[PDB]
């Protein structure tokens, strides 16, 4: 019916009203102290007062760190921007890694603006241009004005345009009998389609037929928009949207990441603060999630040390499964979790714990009931012993071949023999390594 | 056509109970790997789960790529099967993670339902009105069948499709509305006064009778990555062929995911996931593995098949050694299908099948000696020797390869063991690793 | 006959549900407890508003990018509509820098140095370097020896606009590549030719996969004009900026001339076609849908965004084919207006708001809408189903044949508990 991939049995942290975690809630089993710390972090993010707060999720493999970050994102809701990221994303061939890090920092901060739009709309009735007295004079264009007559439901207006709006109108390929949509903030024109007041069965252009827009021609409507700061920076650095030749030639060029200067960021911040002071916009800070943080270089960590001290920084969540490991880009610096000691001071470490046999068994139970499979009790005990013997994940993804082998025998029951066949057909890391050691030519 | 390395494998050779036949469908032997590949094939065909990594491991010349080709041929039509190598990720204009993201998104197909209208009939009158320069174009078309006759209106693209592929009155054309394609089926009027400008010999077709306008429902499969490249910029359809899609932003991918879910929620489109095959996956940086470990956990993720012929070797980007050249985090989230070496009867059957595909009439003793030299040396050498033995055999003008031509081909062309034997006793003739050589013969 | 219909949440409905769940500090247990019991009532009214129809909680409107502009707006026989969009970011420049570095005057040497570096010491000047010009003319084949001095001293955009396909002499060293003589054959070649079809892969891939009927999936979030530069007290800066932003050659090149205006040039004024300012150089978009960033509220998404509404659109076809008279029970008047506009879109026979007399006398009607006395009443649907049996019993015996009662249910919500 649905599609499932390694998650989506997790619906949140599953806490109480006081911050106490239940044993089985939200698809989580165990990890009580980590879930309580994550709930405190969720409350801190929802307070909307702090800047540049960093936590680190430190534990072994298959202990539930990405699951906890997903639960953080699900608990915060879709209004708060969440930016998932791996450590290998920051190495770009178009721009330096520092700019990619700052771009993700500004992408993790949201905004909510209520915008007023001046709108002309209607069905085009009369489209008559007027000519210039000397059109080959070198300066000045061919026409002078274009008269456009629009009609609506209980309304009809005639507009006199300068040529610049008419160039967009002509680029939209409008004619007489079309319903158009002119917005006055940027001069953009949208052509909706043919009016339904004429015949609709004599075309060959697979176009749809709309009726007349209700209300008057000239309106002022309120639109609530959700944007980020990186959208404002990107729109200002590569300007498209005007009707000047720089804007029209900006759309035709191939896009490329540039190094956005700090001056543009300060001016965008000043404009956003002026919008907030007018009661128009509101600020929604969010979370940046960086997975496999040990893949970063020493330069990226050194820039993070300065980027966390800014006054507009979001909450940063990191995760790593490393012990005493040399930092990449250095040769002798041995540090906990592969993170240098200058960053650990600005951090709050949340420690995750390994599981038990019963926790493995019930995690396999929820993963079986999410994938729409039913197993026997003895097969479940075999899977739990198998998960303790080899890995939790190997017991997790052996469920689907067992289900396929159960289906191919015309049964809707997973039994011990299907699990034995799945063992015989698929190996794990330990048995493959044991085959590799006792091999002739790297078998 | 032409003969390839795995041209004899079209399918997997499995029964209705996923049990392999000993010799079927171009595949012989390797029962456990074929059964596991059939299980993975049904896992793909169900389409209910995503982001599962499968590793195929074994010695060289065992049938890993043969297994991948059998899976691809049993997959059937309109299911994406992206086959890449590990060396293609490193590019000068794309990051490794961006190239891996594009390779992931190539393997997810979207099947879009569309509603079209087909129009066929004789053309009565074409009127085309154009500007003085020639930009603005409009006109009317009067098409006609035996029973009905209507007048349509034309646009710029329709007039462009009418002008090229020249249509006159009396020609029979077929128009598809949603594709914008005009095909000329022939001519029926046979106009007498023909200006002798062209050498047209157009076909005589009959009058189409019945309804002028007919509706039909068409289905086409598009990839996800094609939708990102199309929506990325103004001329992305050119970038689909030139490959100039440089580092598509994340906002495009988020909005495309949202619109794909919206199209699924209405019934216009459905998601058909596919198989991404990575041959020589050990030829990858550790940052690629760290990206793969977290890109396998997404909703839009295909089933990934990887092949390795490597033991405990060095992992690239690091300074330690790991099994299969892969880190243990990637090996944690993978199930492993192993492959075992062949017997003499399996090698004989392989050589007989490859001789049947290449159309070579081998003798019995020639087949026995080819099996002997394929069990002492490798299988690919004895497979390569067959065409050379055939080309030697046509020099004597007999269409049957004897053991003499096989012996001549074995004499003329060398194996690896004979090559290292010849090199290791004449080390002065060849260039040393220190760059020293002896050129003079005295 | 009592049967309930189960519906599944849409993407927008689930997004609004998750926003409402995260907004109220996750006291979902209290919401369920006081839902079993029946200012929490105002909290659960938002939830029932979300599962009823997403437009009631927040109306869908025109989806357009955010305009980062400060234009001339109205603080409310023709009306003038002039382009006036600016950027909110202002870059201020002193007059001294402009007047002493960029404009010529008596105390600087902008024009002198420009002439010295561009005319007198240019190596393509035929008055001083005629040998190089003759060498290049033998190399390329240009009929004029001033072509290189003209190419080297004009910008690339001005070069690529006014480029003409002038002829060149055959006695030169520049001949035609193989790729060019392949491409020049198929300029006006028709279909079914072998050379024409072998060089037309892209158009065949365009019409094979139905690329002129696909929909646009991405539009940008913010659109902005270029940053305004302000100099206080100088009209020359304004003139130069207006000339750069609205260059008549370039803006004329990116669009067309009206056809009747071209007729006024060619016939009523005697201007030849070769003297026209050249036009039509803007690239064609992929579809008609890709030509702008503004998306419209369509009356096909309105059906699919509400799951209960889509299940009614699935269910009314059988009742219309079987010829019945349906009646809907509601609780608010907002969805009374919503079903008014939906039924006028679907052109069905319904009431305009005596009712009993019009119900009995007129059988041409189809669907009745009431807000909490019929007999020829066969099929009744409970949209906003509440299991308080006092209202349901009076609704049941308010309205000969077999009677089927229907209830719409949304999976994974309050109503599944209810």
């Amino acid at each position: 019916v649905t599609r499932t991939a390694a998650h989506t049995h997790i619906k949140g942290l599953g806490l109480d009203e006081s911050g106490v975690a239940k044993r089985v809630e939200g698809g989580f089993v165990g990890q009580i102290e980590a879930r309580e710390a994550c709930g405190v972090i969720v409350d801190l993010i929802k307070a909307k007062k702090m800047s540049g707060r960093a936590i680190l999720l430190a534990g072994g493999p298959s202990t539930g760190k990405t699951a906890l970050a997903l639960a953080i994102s699900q608990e915060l809701g879709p209004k708060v921007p969440f930016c998932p990221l791996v450590g290998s994303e920051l190495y770009s061939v178009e721009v330096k890694k520092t700019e990619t890090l700052m771009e993700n920092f500004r992408r993790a901060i949201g905004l909510r603006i209520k915008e007023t739009k001046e709108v002309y709309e209607g069905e085009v009735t009369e489209l008559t241009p007027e000519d210039a007295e000397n059109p080959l004079g070198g300066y000045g264009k061919t026409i002078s004005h274009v008269i456009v007559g629009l009609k609506s439901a209980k309304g009809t207006k005639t507009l006199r345009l300068d040529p610049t709006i008419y160039e967009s109108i002509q680029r939209e390929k409008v004619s007489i009998g079309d319903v158009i949509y002119i917005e006055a903030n940027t001069g953009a024109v949208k052509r909706v389609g043919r009016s339904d007041a004429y015949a609709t069965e004599f075309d060959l252009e697979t176009e749809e037929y709309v009726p007349l827009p209700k209300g008057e021609v000239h309106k002022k409507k309120e639109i609530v928009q959700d944007v980020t700061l990186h959208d404002l920076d990107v729109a200002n650095a590569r300007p498209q949207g005007g009707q000047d030749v720089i804007s029209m030639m900006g759309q035709l060029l191939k896009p490329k990441k540039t190094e956005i200067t700090e001056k543009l960021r300060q001016e965008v911040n000043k404009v956003v603060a002026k919008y907030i002071d007018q009661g128009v916009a509101e600020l929604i800070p969010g979370v940046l999630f960086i997975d496999e943080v040990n893949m970063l270089d020493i330069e990226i960590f050194t820039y993070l040390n300065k980027a966390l001290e800014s006054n507009i920084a979001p909450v940063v969540v990191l995760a790593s499964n490393r012990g005493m490991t040399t930092v990449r880009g250095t040769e002798d610096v041995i540090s906990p979790h592969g993170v240098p000691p200058d960053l650990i001071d600005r951090l709050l470490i949340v420690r995750t714990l390994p599981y038990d046999k019963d926790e493995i068994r019930t995690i396999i139970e929820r993963r079986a009931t999410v994938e729409r499979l039913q197993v026997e009790s003895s097969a479940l005990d075999l899977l739990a012993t198998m998960g303790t013997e080899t890995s939790l994940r190997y017991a997790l993804q052996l469920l689907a071949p067992c289900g396929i082998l159960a289906q191919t025998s015309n049964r809707k029951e997973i039994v011990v023999n299907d699990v034995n066949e799945a063992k015989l057909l698929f190996l794990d890391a330990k048995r493959s390594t044991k085959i590799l050691e006792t091999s002739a030519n790297y078998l | 056509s032409l003969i390839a390395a795995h041209s004899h494998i079209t399918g997997l050779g499995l029964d209705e109970n996923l049990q392999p036949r000993p010799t079927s469908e171009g595949m012989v032997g390797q029962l456990q790997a074929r059964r596991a590949a059939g299980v993975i094939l049904k896992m793909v065909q169900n389409g209910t789960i995503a982001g599962r990594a499968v590793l195929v491991a074994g010695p060289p010349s065992t049938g890993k790529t043969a297994l991948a080709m059998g899976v691809s041929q049993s997959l059937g039509k309109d299911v994406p099967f992206t086959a890449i190598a590990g060396s293609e990720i490193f590019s000068l204009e794309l990051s490794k993670t961006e190239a891996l993201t594009q390779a992931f998104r190539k393997s997810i197909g979207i099947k879009i339902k569309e509603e079209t209208e087909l129009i066929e009939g004789e053309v009565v009158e074409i009127q085309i009105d154009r500007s003085i320069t020639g930009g603005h174009k409009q006109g009317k078309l009067t098409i006609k069948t035996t029973d009905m006759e209507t007048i349509y209106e034309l646009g710029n693209k329709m007039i462009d499709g009418l002008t090229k592929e020249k249509v006159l009155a009396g020609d029979v054309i077929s128009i598809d509305k949603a594709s914008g394609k005009i095909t000329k089926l022939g001519r029926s009027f046979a106009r007498s006064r023909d200006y002798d400008a062209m050498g047209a010999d157009t076909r005589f077709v009959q009058c189409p009778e019945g309804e002028l306008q007919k509706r039909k429902t068409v289905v086409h499969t598009v990839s996800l990555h094609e939708i990102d490249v199309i929506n990325s910029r103004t001329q992305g359809f050119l970038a689909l062929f030139t490959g100039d899609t440089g580092e598509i932003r994340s906002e495009v991918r988020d909005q495309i995911n949202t619109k794909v879910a919206e199209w699924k929620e209405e019934g216009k489109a459905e998601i058909v996931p596919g198989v991404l095959f990575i041959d020589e996956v050990h030829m990858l940086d550790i940052e690629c593995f760290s990206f793969i470990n977290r890109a396998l956990e997404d909703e839009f993720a295909p089933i990934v098949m990887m092949a390795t012929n490597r033991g405990v070797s060095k992992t690239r980007g690091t300074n330690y050694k790991s099994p299969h050249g892969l880190p243990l985090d990637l090996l944690d989230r993978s199930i492993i299908i192993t492959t075992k070496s062949y017997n003499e009867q399996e090698i004989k059957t392989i050589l007989s099948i490859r001789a049947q595909e290449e159309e070579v009439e081998l003798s019995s003793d020639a087949l026995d000696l080819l099996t002997k030299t394929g069990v002492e040396t490798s299988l690919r050498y004895s497979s390569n020797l067959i065409s050379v033995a055939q080309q030697i055999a046509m020099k004597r003008k007999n269409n049957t390869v004897e053991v003499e031509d096989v012996k001549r081909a074995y004499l003329l062309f060398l194996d690896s063991a004979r090559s290292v034997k010849y090199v290791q006793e004449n080390e002065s003739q060849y260039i040393d690793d220190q760059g020293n050589v002896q050129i003079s013969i005295a | 006959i009592e049967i309930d219909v189960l519906c599944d949440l849409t993407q927008r409905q689930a997004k609004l549900y998750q926003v409402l769940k995260s907004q109220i500090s996750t006291n979902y247990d209290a919401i369920e407890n006081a839902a079993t019991n029946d200012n929490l009532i105002n909290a659960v009214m938002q939830f029932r508003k979300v599962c009823n129809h997403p437009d009631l909680f927040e109306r869908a409107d025109v989806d357009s990018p955010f305009s980062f502009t400060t234009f001339g707006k109205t603080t409310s026989k023709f009306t003038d509509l002039i382009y006036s969009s600016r950027n909110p970011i202002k870059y201020s420049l002193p007059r001294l820098i402009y007047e002493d570095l960029i404009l010529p005057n008596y105390n600087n040497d902008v024009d002198i140095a420009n002439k010295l570096k561009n005319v007198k010491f240019n190596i393509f000047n035929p008055s001083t370097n005629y040998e190089l010009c003759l060498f290049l003319s033998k190399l390329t084949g240009e009929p004029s020896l001033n072509e290189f001095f003209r190419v080297s001293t004009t910008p690339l955009l001005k070069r690529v606009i006014e480029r003409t396909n002038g002829p060149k002499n055959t006695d030169s060293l520049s001949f035609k590549t193989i790729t060019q003589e392949l491409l020049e054959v198929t300029r006006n070649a028709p279909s079914e030719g072998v050379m024409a079809s072998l060089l037309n892969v892209e158009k065949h891939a365009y019409e094979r996969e139905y690329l002129n009927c696909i929909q646009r999936g991405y539009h940008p979030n913010v659109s902005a004009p270029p940053v305004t530069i302000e100099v206080l007290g100088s009209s020359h800066v304004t003139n130069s900026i207006n000339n750069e932003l609205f260059d008549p050659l370039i803006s004329q090149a990116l669009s067309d001339i009206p056809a009747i205006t071209q007729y006024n040039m060619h016939v009523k004024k005697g201007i030849p076609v070769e003297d026209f300012p050249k036009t039509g150089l803007f690239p064609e978009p992929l579809n008609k849908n890709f030509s702008s960033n503004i998306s419209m509220p369509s009356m096909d998404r309105f059906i699919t965004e509400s799951a209960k509404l889509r299940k009614l659109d699935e269910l009314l076809v059988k009742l219309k084919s079987e010829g019945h008279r349906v009646l809907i029970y509601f609780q608010m008047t907002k969805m009374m207006d919503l079903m008014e506009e939906y039924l006028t879109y679907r052109q069905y026979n319904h009431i305009r708001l005596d009712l009993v007399h019009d119900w009995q006398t007129n059988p041409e009607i189809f669907v009745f809408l009431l807000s909490t006395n019929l007999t020829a009443a066969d099929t009744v649907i409970f949209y906003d189903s509440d299991w308080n049996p006092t209202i349901d019993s009076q609704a049941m015996d308010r309205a000969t044949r077999q009677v089927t009662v229907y209830r719409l249910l949304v999976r994974g919500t309050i109503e599944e508990r209810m």
């Binding site: 004619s175 007489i176 009998g177 043919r194 007041a197 004429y198 015949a199 609709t200 004599f202 | 053309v123 009565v124 009158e125 074409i126 009127q127 085309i128 009105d129 154009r130 500007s131 003085i132 603005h136 409009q138 006109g139 009317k140 209106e153 249509v167 006159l168 009155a169 009396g170 009027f189 106009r191 006064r193 | 056809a259 009747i260 071209q262 007729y263 006024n264 060619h266 016939v267």
Partner: peptide
């Protein structure tokens, strides 16, 4: 009733007529 057709608006523009017996081309 029958809906009217869309108005056709071609002044100052050329014309190519392609009939059964004979073809035109009107120029300015």
């Amino acid at each position: 009733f029958v809906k009217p057709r869309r108005p056709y608006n071609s002044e100052g523009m050329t014309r190519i007529l392609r009939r059964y017996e004979e073809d035109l081309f009107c120029t300015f």
